[PDB]
């Protein structure tokens, strides 16, 4: 299938709809110019006692903190 | 802003549409019963000279390696 949901997304090669050379991602709160965000970048402000969600340094999603 | 895109998803509390207690995810190739898949679980079969995509153990998406 495709690495980018949209054919407009320049993070993917138009021909293959796979990520372009160098690229690690095409979308998500932890994607920055087709690269993963640095490990520990805050990606979701938490409320109550909960810790903030942070980037993994190895994926483009913002995960629940673990 | 909900942690699950579907109201039917039992990984999320129906009242808040946030993850249920203990839950880490509700969707994705690296989610297994509302928990993250073990680090290094293969989530995408690669072709040519490329390594396979593996689960991080810290997220529910299957990332590029």
From Swiss-Prot, chain A:
Please give the function described in this protein's UniProt entry.
Answer: Inhibits platelet aggregation induced by ADP, thrombin, platelet-activating factor and collagen. Acts by inhibiting fibrinogen interaction with platelet receptors alpha-IIb/beta-3 (ITGA2B/ITGB3).
Query: What organism does the UniProt record list as the source?
Result: Calloselasma rhodostoma
Q: Where is the Disintegrin domain?
A: 1-66
The identity of this protein, by name, is: Disintegrin rhodostomin
Cystines in this chain: 2-17, 4-12, 11-34, 25-31, 30-55, 43-62
Coordinates of motif Cell attachment site in the sequence? 47-49
Curated annotation (Swiss-Prot), chain B:
Report the residue ranges that make up the Disintegrin domain in this protein: 1-65
For this chain, the annotated S-S bridges are: 2-17, 4-12, 11-34, 25-31, 30-55, 43-62
Q: Where is this motif: Cell attachment site?
A: 47-49
Q: What function does this protein fulfil?
A: Inhibits platelet aggregation induced by ADP, thrombin, platelet-activating factor and collagen. Acts by inhibiting fibrinogen interaction with platelet receptors alpha-IIb/beta-3 (ITGA2B/ITGB3).
What's the protein name?
Disintegrin rhodostomin
- What fragment of the full-length protein is this? 410 to 474 of 478
């Amino acid at each position: 299938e495709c690495d980018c949901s949209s054919p407009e997304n320049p993070c993917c090669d138009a021909a293959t709809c796979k990520l372009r050379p160098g690229a690690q991602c095409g979308e998500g709160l932890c994607c920055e110019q087709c690269k993963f965000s640095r490990a520990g970048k805050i990606c979701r402000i938490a409320r109550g006692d909960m810790p903030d969600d942070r980037c993994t340094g190895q994926s483009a999603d913002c995960p629940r903190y673990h």
